[PDB]
Design a protein around this ligand. Structure first.
Ligand code: NI
Ligand code: NI
Lengths: 224, 214
């Protein structure tokens, strides 16, 4: 398995610095020219920077020209991007991308991509999410979890440790007017199986090492 | 730089239809074009290089044609899992540039949403804020209206929507609408209603609750 494993994104304040590194395995990096490609949330693909096998030739897109530095450690089979004076327009998913290598002929289309790491440039701080149940009321009933007030992206929601996938819908996040993200995750289940089967949504939010679970049950009313 | 113009931006197309996306270059690039498929979230997958050569492992309904300035990506029989944004890029010269993309959406028969409504959990109310959540479940088309009525008055500019990706089997969406207000404003009222207008429903559907009623 040829893989490109990238790491080191995160959240920084405007003007800060980050280094993205992409670790190549199952092939020798020195054989290929390497690119960075990025993507703003819900926008197109923008090419970022190029580097020769030899570290001989580097190119930059005008947006990043004097701020980003592409580099290469072939002995570590790794590709780097230093990102100085980061800005709002730099927030995006960053892809480490391998160009096809033929000798004769030209072929700078992408053979293999990394999975992408996220870079967020914001003045807002890493907050972890509060998780609330969307309780099933009263032959299908729906239930879920409200993952509210976190930063930055992403979270991921599973159900019963991943043992429940059928009929699950995890919604894209929205930015609340407060500047924090919020999303819902829901599942429809047979209502005859309501009071017998336990439902636990497993929320994970890496950017703050917050991992919350929650038992979703219908609300009986023994109060005051 | 070389600019690439893709037509169209969005596509509606029934399963089994032939779909054709174009990509016009600002200058002759000969055969140096690639097509990619991007499922949202995941990285782009390479479909076609050198204008028309298929990448290994790509189903044959995908085909490339064109030379010099005008190029075409073609899906001869659109499958339900083909929903994706598709990009062309030129490798004639650096900087490498992409088209703006084409969002491909599957057309299917009208399906009315199942509506649900979820009152704020007690825990959330304990922290002084109230989220009411309405669900529209497994519907088509994406076009739906969700109106919030609190004690029978229509709410404006205090709620947000989110739509799932088209489902890769039945081609249906799901929508969540969240109403948000302070524990104070939430406690001034009794009836919380979610009214949904959608093509597959002959007349609006309202799900609702009165505050804390098992
Ligand atoms: Ni030289
Ligand atoms: Ni009481």
């Amino acid at each position: 398995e040829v893989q490109l494993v990238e790491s080191g994104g995160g959240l920084v304040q405007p003007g800060g610095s980050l280094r993205l590194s992409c670790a190549a395995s199952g092939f020798t990096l020195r054989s290929y020219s390497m690119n960075w490609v990025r993507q703003a949330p819900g926008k197109g693909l923008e090419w970022v920077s190029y580097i020769s096998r030899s570290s001989h030739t580097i190119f930059y897109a005008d947006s990043v020209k004097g701020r980003f530095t592409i580099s290469r450690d072939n002995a570590k089979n790794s590709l780097y991007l230093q990102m100085d004076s980061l800005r709002d327009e730099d927030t995006a998913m960053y892809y480490c991308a391998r160009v096809y290598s033929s000798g004769w002929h030209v072929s700078d289309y992408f053979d293999y991509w990394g999975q992408g790491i996220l870079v967020t440039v914001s003045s807002a701080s890493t907050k972890g999410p509060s998780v609330f149940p969307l309780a099933p009321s009263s032959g299908t009933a729906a239930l879920g979890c409200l993952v509210k007030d976190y930063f930055p992206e992403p979270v991921t929601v599973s159900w019963n440790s991943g043992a429940l996938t059928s009929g699950v819908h995890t919604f894209p996040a929205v930015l609340q007017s407060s500047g924090l993200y919020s999303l819902s995750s829901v599942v429809t289940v047979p209502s005859s199986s309501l009071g017998t089967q336990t439902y636990i949504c497993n929320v994970n939010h890496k950017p703050s090492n917050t991992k919350v679970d929650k038992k979703v049950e219908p609300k009986s009313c023994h109060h005051h | 730089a070389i600019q690439l113009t893709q037509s169209p931006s969005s596509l509606s197309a029934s399963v089994g239809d032939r779909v054709t996306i174009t990509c016009r270059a600002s200058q002759g690039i000969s055969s140096a074009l690639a097509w990619y498929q991007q499922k949202p979230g995941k990285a782009p997958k390479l479909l076609i290089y050198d204008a028309s050569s298929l990448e290994s492992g790509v189903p044959s309904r995908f085909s490339g044609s064109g030379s010099g300035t005008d190029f075409t990506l073609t899906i001869s029989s659109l499958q339900p899992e083909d929903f994706a944004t598709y990009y062309c890029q030129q490798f004639n010269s650096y900087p490498l540039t992409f088209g703006g993309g084409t969002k491909v959406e599957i057309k299917r028969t009208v399906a009315a949403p199942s509506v649900f409504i979820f009152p704020p959990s007690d825990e959330q109310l304990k922290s002084g804020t109230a989220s009411v959540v309405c669900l529209l479940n497994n519907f088509y088309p994406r076009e739906a209206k969700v109106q919030w009525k609190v004690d029978n008055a229509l709410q404006s500019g205090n709620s947000q929507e989110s739509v799932t990706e088209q489902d890769s089997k039945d081609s249906t969406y799901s929508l969540s609408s969240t109403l948000t207000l302070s524990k104070a404003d939430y406690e001034k009222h009794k009836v919380y209603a979610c009214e949904v207008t959608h093509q597959g429903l002959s007349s609006p559907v309202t799900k609702s609750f009165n505050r804390g009623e098992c």
